[PDB]
Amino acid sequence: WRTLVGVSHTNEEVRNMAEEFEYDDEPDEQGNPKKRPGKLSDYIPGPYP
């Protein structure tokens, strides 16, 4: 996501684009899986698992 900033989009625009997807996070204090919205350091996700 960070490679689109300053090339075809604005920083504030790419952040909104990434936040519409979900990524695996660190497990909580009990060890269960968690999810979080995307960041600029993430990669563009694909349609199939």
Partner 1 sequence: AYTSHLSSKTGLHFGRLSLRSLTAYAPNLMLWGGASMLGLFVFTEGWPKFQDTLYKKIPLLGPTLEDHTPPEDKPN
Residues at the interface with partner 1 (CB under 8 A):
2-3, 5-6, 10-12, 14, 40
Q: Which is nearer to partner 1, 3 or 34 (CB)?
A: 3
- The least distance separating partner 1 from the CB of residue 11, rounded to whole angstroms, comes to 5
Q: 8 with 25: CB under 8 angstroms?
A: no
How far is the C-alpha of 24 from the C-alpha of 33, rounded, in Å?
8
Phi, then psi, of 8 in degrees rounded to 5:
-135, -10
Q: Which is nearer to partner 1, 2 or 36 (CB)?
A: 2
Name the token pair of 45: 């996700």
Q: Which is nearer to partner 1, 11 or 27 (CB)?
A: 11
